[PDB]
Design a binder for this molecule. Structure first.
Ligand SMILES: *[C@@H]1O[C@H](CO)[C@@H](O[C@@H]2O[C@H](CO)[C@@H](O)[C@H](O)[C@H]2NC(C)=O)[C@H](O)[C@H]1NC(C)=O
Ligand SMILES: *[C@@H]1O[C@H](CO)[C@@H](O[C@@H]2O[C@H](CO)[C@@H](O)[C@H](O)[C@H]2NC(C)=O)[C@H](O)[C@H]1NC(C)=O
Ligand SMILES: *[C@@H]1O[C@H](CO)[C@@H](O[C@@H]2O[C@H](CO)[C@@H](O)[C@H](O)[C@H]2NC(C)=O)[C@H](O)[C@H]1NC(C)=O
Ligand SMILES: *[C@@H]1O[C@H](CO)[C@@H](O)[C@H](O)[C@H]1NC(C)=O
Ligand SMILES: *[C@@H]1O[C@H](CO)[C@@H](O)[C@H](O)[C@H]1NC(C)=O
Ligand SMILES: *[C@@H]1O[C@H](CO)[C@@H](O)[C@H](O)[C@H]1NC(C)=O
Ligand SMILES: [Cl-]
Ligand SMILES: [Cl-]
Ligand SMILES: [Cl-]
Lengths: 401, 397, 396
């Protein structure tokens, strides 16, 4: 009877063990494969930056002041220079003249035109630029409008030009730019608004080229008077869609959290303000300075600060993250100050307050992948249900003999 | 015996693997919704406000702070500006002076920087916060403050989107004009100006003198964070200890507990920031016993305060960057607003931004690699075609 | 008897699929992040951004390295376009007076060693885990920045320095004086001059040479800089499973690059820069300027063909989180000024404090493991072949 018992058991094993599988298969489990290597021909990311100051004082015209005056806290609700102004006498005297609206006939005004004309000029800010031993120029930077206003992106990849690639670790295989933030052009700050700031310097965001920047939210800061080193590591993350995961596959061409937020924010403002901020996509009318102040700014602030319901984006199936390690040294040194001052025709003090050097590069281990993989596909299921029957057909043959 | 082995053999390998109690570590990095915002603790690098140090304070803590020598006199080697020296020489006049009960905790609580004075502005996710939103916590730096400590029983603060908007922004005034004159090197004085900050889970006490990060005056500092949840297995799979002075097990809680017992054992007192009910160390004890003792533990010790791994750890990845404050264009505004000079603003004001990136949540969990149920399935087929061949060889005989 | 040529036809088919998988040679990467005990403290190398102390540059030095340092033109004269303060210009015009001057043997290594910043002068204080360290605890190492120093180089045969707890207390703290008053006047742009003041630092395993001009991080004067670290051990598989190369004494990307760079310069310049290994003749200042510098720059900037190194099977990476506070505070300035015999302003421009330590979770491992070893292969078959060993005794 022992053989018969063995045969009976052989059936009861192909029963449990094959049932263990189908249940496990239908849980749609996954594994996450991690790897960190030194990739060759790494694709250099896009680098977007903004001057923390949105409007050059010297480009603000009488008409500009008339329309955007109250928005910039340079005027009160009755087109007068505020009682509570805190300006140096020379600038106050320049503004009091500008704010003289006697016999003044207002002329069509537009925030986008204002940003484009008054925003800091890359041609003036960019003192020097080098990528992998090659000299780059203002033309190598693309204009992109953000909430900070007129910003610039290096290696945007929208020119159809050949890819910029990194191959070795260290500053040499990266980007180095020397900027002049031009504090002498900073708009006087007389109050707190979404368009003014207490700070001097630039905001920077390193991002994949198929992903738009969200620099007011996700950027990092770089201060004047320093050379800042940014050692990076590219991290590629891949996710599975349902049933294995939660991701969504690809106004914008590729799906990204940012692209999703911008799209959502635009619809929200259009719905609640009947206008879009000038940096938003679409064809809705541009918000007036009054709309910015009364509706648009509060609306966008609500979304990026308090909102928990409206602009909630789902995970992309493909995300590229850039790990960053920042460090810095002082510029200029006492020994080099006079050289730089004479070179760019400034005072030594100006150099120390306005000049900055930014280095963006990758470390040796420049590439990391974190990919979700199907842990138990239909093929693996069979191979188990199959290899198990190859043991029951043997346990039945021995019984047969 | 040709199959009495192949059965046993291939059966043995899997059996051995189970009793090896193997594990796998599952990694995942996602954008979590309703992420729980951490606690943020900070200290002014200066421990005692110069203007709050009384004659009695100087008398007791004078030597500890290097403001007096061992004979209650202002040191020969003092390096102070004339105005401050003149203020101290008058404080240090102990003729006809009758000392009155003194203790370090009261001293810290009364002379330590006041959040009500340091906090110029505070916003969390578009909402204005206030000094009342900060809880007082005593550390080795003295009187410190924790934002979102979670000990009020108030509803949780949560983050949902990436970027500064969904985080905390505070503007601080470090008040250098209140910094205690530094005439020597002690564990209570420093050469630096600014604050120390530590981002930590709410069920984990801060160890800010050891694990904190610095934030400098004259800058706006951006701190982009990522929460990392790590889970470990206990024996036999791992080494961790599952969750006293403190409620949840953490390396820090363990160290603090250990340090306290060490000082009590060797100094018969505890530093004022330590838990328990042991007597507070006097300034003399601080100098002669407590400070050296604690320094030994956090610097040289390799035997006494060695803590075992917690089964549950929450780590916060940080990326710092900064811009300058104030700009030339905003200096006068800030100066007039807070009634200071433009130079003061540049030396004392700082802005701190603590927020999370889009991919805000990472999990690293140890999971058992070979569970008993898994073992049975692999061996089930052969285990029976051998136990059948076992009652079979005993059937032949 | 047909049932026998079936067992073989089943053992055959269970071998085939299994064999194929063994042939893809798959791998898995095991990750783990823990608080290690007795962690081995890394080596810390640092350089002053300034390569030559102004006061150590002699008439002979200026004569040979003058044009290289942009202090002289191609005719041994002080440049028309000099931008120096009058006192320094007057000191240099005197040095650059070569009337009746007979040049004497010069070499860049001696120049670096003699004129480079002295650790004995830069190091104001040094502590590791409660113990006072000294200039003798720093080893001299020549890099492209010139004369640099490495803490805990581990080449003395001394007992290992170990970390055990998280926080600054279990790490290194050094106070440096970068000595800007010694910085060489900058009159132009060269590979040996800089616009910046401060130091470059690189944290690295002791069996890996530094490549500090490329991979270092910066530390600024006037701050205390905190560097919270995490050691990350990465192990890779060689072919067929992976791409790595198994083991200068140990194989590392840096060691590979340095070796390659040296060969390249020797091949194209018939000399090596003074910080490079080997026994090739040292490059003259003229060679540096005309051949060596451009050559090395090409390699570390443009090259995509010559110095491409393959992945090591064993890599140690150090995660870093930097933060900073200001030094000195108004209240401590006078103390420091009096202590080191400087002015309060000097202190603010030259003094820096550097803290290098580890966090609680100080150790992370990322190891590639063979997914399917031979022993595991038999297991998936052994059973099928065992049910063939029985049908094999009932056929004979
Ligand atoms: C790891 O520890 C954390 C606490 O540090 C646990 O998080 C808590 O989980 C419980 C149950 O959901 C909640 O009631 C608490 O509010 C959570 N604390 C927080 C986040 O503030 C977590 O559950 C632990 N993980 C495991 C499974 O061990
Ligand atoms: C703004 O700050 C100034 C000090 O800079 C305050 O003024 C001093 O005020 C005290 C108390 O009234 C007087 O004893 C001093 O004589 C004042 N000094 C000077 C230089 O005037 C002033 O009170 C503050 N303003 C407000 C409204 O708080
Ligand atoms: C990876 O390489 C490191 C060296 O960089 C190895 O660490 C050494 O291990 C040996 C054997 O225990 C020790 O004698 C040395 O002292 C270690 N060097 C250190 C840490 O200073 C490590 O073993 C290698 N890992 C593997 C298994 O490849
Ligand atoms: C991820 O997206 C990038 C573009 O951003 C693309 O280059 C890459 O092929 C994608 N990876 C996969 C396989 O989804
Ligand atoms: C240099 O700047 C000054 C103003 O400071 C200006 O007057 C002069 O024209 C400038 N020189 C040149 C040649 O651009
Ligand atoms: C201190 O420095 C001065 C120069 O500023 C020097 O003359 C003096 O000798 C120094 N004092 C000592 C004792 O080293
Ligand atoms: Cl949003
Ligand atoms: Cl401890
Ligand atoms: Cl190279």
């Amino acid at each position: 009877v022992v053989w018969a018992l063995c045969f009976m058991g052989s059936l009861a094993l192909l029963a449990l063990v094959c049932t263990n599988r189908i249940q496990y298969y239908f849980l749609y489990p996954h594994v996450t494969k991690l790897d960190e290597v030194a990739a060759t021909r790494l694709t250099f990311p896009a680098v977007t930056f903004c001057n923390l100051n949105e409007f050059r004082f010297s480009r603000v015209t009488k008409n500009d002041l008339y329309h955007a005056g109250e928005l910039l806290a340079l005027l009160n609700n009755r087109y007068e220079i505020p009682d509570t102004q805190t300006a140096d006498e020379k600038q106050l005297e320049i503004l009091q003249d500008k704010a003289n609206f006697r016999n003044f006939k207002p002329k069509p005004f537009n925030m986008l035109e204002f940003y484009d004309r008054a925003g800091h000029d890359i041609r003036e800010m960019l003192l020097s630029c080098f990528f992998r031993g090659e000299q780059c120029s203002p033309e190598d930077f693309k204009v992109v409008f953000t909430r900070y206003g007129k910003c610039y992106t290096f290696n945007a990849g929208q020119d159809g030009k050949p890819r910029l690639i990194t191959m070795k670790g260290g500053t040499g295989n990266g980007l180095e730019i020397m900027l002049d933030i031009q504090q002498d052009e900073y708009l006087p700050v007389w109050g707190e608004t979404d368009e003014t700031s207490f700070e001097a310097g630039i905001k920077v965001q390193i991002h994949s080229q198929d992903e738009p920047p969200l620099i007011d939210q996700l950027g990092f800061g770089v201060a004047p008077g320093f050379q800042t080193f940014v050692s990076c590591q590219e991290q590629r993350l891949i996710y599975l869609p349902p049933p294995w995961g939660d991701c969504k596959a690809t106004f914008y061409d590729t799906y990204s959290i940012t692209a999703c937020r911008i799209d959502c924010e635009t619809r929200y403002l259009v719905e609640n303000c009947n206008c879009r901020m000038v940096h938003m996509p679409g064809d809705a009318p541009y918000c007036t300075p009054e709309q910015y102040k009364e509706c648009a700014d509060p609306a966008l602030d609500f979304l990026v600060e308090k909102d928990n319901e409206y602009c909630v984006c789902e995970m992309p199936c493909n995300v590229t993250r850039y790990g960053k390690e920042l460090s810095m040294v002082k510029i200029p040194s006492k020994a080099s100050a006079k050289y730089l001052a004479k070179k760019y025709n400034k005072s030594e003090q100006y150099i120390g307050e306005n000049i900055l050097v930014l280095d963006i590069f990758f470390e040796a281990l420049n590439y990391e992948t974190i990919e979700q993989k199907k842990a138990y596909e239909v093929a693996g299921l069979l191979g188990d249900i199959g290899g198990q029957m190859g043991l029951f057909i043997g346990a039945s043959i021995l019984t047969v003999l």
